[PDB]
Write a protein that binds this ligand. Structure first.
Ligand SMILES: [Cu+2]
Ligand SMILES: [Cu+2]
Ligand SMILES: [Cu+2]
Ligand SMILES: [Cu+2]
Ligand SMILES: [Cu+2]
Ligand SMILES: [Cu+2]
Ligand SMILES: [Cu+2]
Ligand SMILES: [Cu+2]
Ligand SMILES: [Cu+2]
Ligand SMILES: [Cu+2]
Ligand SMILES: [Cu+2]
Ligand SMILES: [Cu+2]
Ligand SMILES: [Cu+2]
Ligand SMILES: [Cu+2]
Ligand SMILES: [Fe+3]
Ligand SMILES: [Fe+3]
Ligand SMILES: [Fe+3]
Ligand SMILES: [Fe+3]
Ligand SMILES: [Fe+3]
Ligand SMILES: [Fe+3]
Ligand SMILES: [Fe+3]
Ligand SMILES: [Fe+3]
Ligand SMILES: [Fe+3]
Ligand SMILES: [Fe+3]
Ligand SMILES: [Fe+3]
Ligand SMILES: [Fe+3]
Lengths: 169, 169, 169, 169, 169, 169
């Protein structure tokens, strides 16, 4: 018949629907971090822009998965996007730590999704994941890890202000 | 002291947090409509782009409210973003009807939020809402209503294909 | 000695020679579809151009495999290019269905060729295949599947004419 | 009625279908010559490019005949494209000799096809053939003949390398 | 905590440190080949430039591995860079043979490093290797193999001089 | 006869071969410093770039000596490039101190090499050394000495971060 599906396993489809939810979740977390550093009583512009950009990127990550679902002839199925764990994210160091944890969680899920596609012998899906996600996670995690190291080096108060400018401000 | 809050009532703050949730919800609905018209067995490109654009606009609507919360010295508080009512949205006529209903729901909520800000004598908030939201809703609702009328005029099959091109395709 | 061959298994070489034949075959099929829609009594220009382009692309697919054979130090071996199954391909819907089937057949062969290269632990060959072929097949199959859906939506007669313009015409 | 056929004899149509097959065959031969001179153990770049270009030209020769069939209101009918006589083509001198023979064979077939169109009083077909094929064959044959003469003059080893650069390399 | 390491096995880290050493070694070999063809009593400019470029490329290969070590949260550990096997590399044919052997050795080590990363289920590392190294080795080996074939074709004396110009000179 | 050697003493040749080794060694040291400041747990970008640039410069220093060996009709002879003394280089102050020591060691060796060329009455070699090396060492040593002074002035933590930006970052 006339559908495009070929070599695309139901467990893979379901995994992509889960990863779509996880990317939107990460986008939502970063959104909340951004609004937290734009409070009059926090007021760190660099972090605000940096997390707003991160939230927009994660949204793109989701949308590319959504597209891939449809390209493969799967069926996108949405779930609720759960609110983030906190309403207030602490200092810039606290938020970076949380962001590191979030990215590492997203990366584990992509590694699991990749493990799924190879188990099912879907080399196009594996390639997709490697091409658009895995090196990108590696760069993002390394990047945030260096931020943590420098925030600890700079220390609180003035160091936090000056470090915040270097994000991009 | 040193906070910026002035003439900003807790009921208004809470209303903005609700409207933030509603805008993200509308963004999510449009996202699902977009992925629905990008199915190999639906394949209407115009509608796909049109709802993807609408989803991105609603996201911006949310983000501007988030900014306004912080500008006024409120505290943004996020809630879950509920999944949309359907997984499959029907023909382009069915989806436009649903989109009309969604926009009208969003507009009623903004009108209620406006009613709240005038009740509390917050003329800056009222202005904000009128300036960035209300005429925009009016245009969007009128626009979708004309689409319904023309989809009914064009009829199913070929008419749907040709109409879909005129959205922008 | 002085040859370049390394880590390239005879079964892989033979698989590439088979895939070279299959790509030329697909190029020949598309050629015949093109000449069919350029008949005075069929006269669908869009389909003519679209299948002529597809035939040229498949030729490039073959030539890149030929190059890869030589780059790896294999030996290209040609076989006859069999004539296509039909001399006349029907309506634009009939031809698109046949094209979908052809692409899915080519994709299965590439997936088998990939399975061969991983079985033999040839990661460069696997990469080659993923990089130049697999996502390309996925896009092409999805693309033709949407065409089928829209041809069915448009219906015969006028719909076929109008749809044919949208291919590119 | 509504077909375009006029003054176009069935023997001419059948001759064009044969010439279409012969042009594709010549394209296939040149393809194999190209892949032969791109072997790591042959490695003559000029000849590789020169035969790849020749293969692409012969393809165009075929496609123009295919178009002419349809323009005249004939019906294109494809046959298998037979594999070339050899898998390995020898030195650059050996391949040029074989190419000379191939071109002379193609030219005899075009001269026969022309003899057919004049016998049937089809002056448009004769013109077509003269305009797009016959002078082109004459130039190609003369060109390859000069290559043979110079390859013999240059001699084997270094001469072959240097001559190969002059093709275009 | 705050480090970036995730899904990166100690055997992989150690393999990257070994490959870093091997790339620097290859850079050193090519350096010596370059200085050998820049002797007043050898004086082959093309080979000089060609091996100097190759030495610079291998250095880049090393540096990209070093970067990857740090990106993954490994720890780069340097070892001595051993002097090359010879002080004098013979004719251009002798040096090309040695270069072919060196590249094939480097390629086997990368294939082993890749085998290591898949064994440990590190798909990002595998991708890294395929993306930046494996096709590059394949091209380099094929390239040098064609040089050997042409050097043998050209023969010693004048042929060597003329061939040397074609490298780039 | 036909060699270029003139007024070039074997002790000078041997000294240049030693200096070639020392420049490569210094390049290797700077390489390790660079990779040390690119660790996720060190993360000082300025120092990373600054030592990567220094490593590339030292490589050029070596290559110019190699060229000079051949220009004078000497024979380049390579030795192992020993691994640097440490795997981890401490704070930016610790690394700058080590870099100062390394440069001073390289400078003493060049001063000895110069003493050698004047002892042997090789004024071209002396000039070469003065023209390309000695003022360059003087500038580099002075430069690093000012860095030490400012790192001590800035102090640890925030000062180190801010100073690191001024290197170039
Ligand atoms: Cu699958
Ligand atoms: Cu793989
Ligand atoms: Cu890739
Ligand atoms: Cu208020
Ligand atoms: Cu206004
Ligand atoms: Cu293999
Ligand atoms: Cu892969
Ligand atoms: Cu006729
Ligand atoms: Cu005539
Ligand atoms: Cu004429
Ligand atoms: Cu690993
Ligand atoms: Cu890959
Ligand atoms: Cu001297
Ligand atoms: Cu002087
Ligand atoms: Fe993401
Ligand atoms: Fe990310
Ligand atoms: Fe909205
Ligand atoms: Fe709207
Ligand atoms: Fe293909
Ligand atoms: Fe295709
Ligand atoms: Fe021809
Ligand atoms: Fe020709
Ligand atoms: Fe390398
Ligand atoms: Fe290489
Ligand atoms: Fe130096
Ligand atoms: Fe220096």
């Amino acid at each position: 018949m006339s559908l495009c599906r070929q070599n695309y396993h139901e467990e893979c489809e379901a995994g992509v629907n889960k990863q779509i939810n996880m990317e939107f979740y990460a986008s939502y977390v970063y959104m909340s971090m951004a609004s937290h550093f734009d409070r009059d009583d926090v007021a760190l512009k660099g972090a605000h822009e940096f997390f707003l950009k991160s939230s927009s990127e994660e949204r793109e990550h989701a949308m590319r998965l959504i597209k891939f679902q449809n390209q493969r002839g799967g069926r996108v199925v949405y779930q609720d996007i759960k609110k983030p764990e906190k309403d207030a994210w602490g200092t810039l160091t606290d938020a970076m730590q949380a962001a590191l944890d979030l990215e590492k969680h997203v990366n584990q899920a992509l590694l699991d999704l990749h493990a799924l596609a190879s188990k099912h012998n879907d080399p196009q899906m594996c390639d997709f994941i490697e091409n658009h996600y895995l090196t990108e996670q590696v760069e993002a995690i390394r990047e945030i890890s260096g931020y943590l190291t420098n925030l600890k080096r700079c220390g609180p108060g003035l160091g936090e202000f000056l470090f915040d400018k270097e994000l991009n401000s």
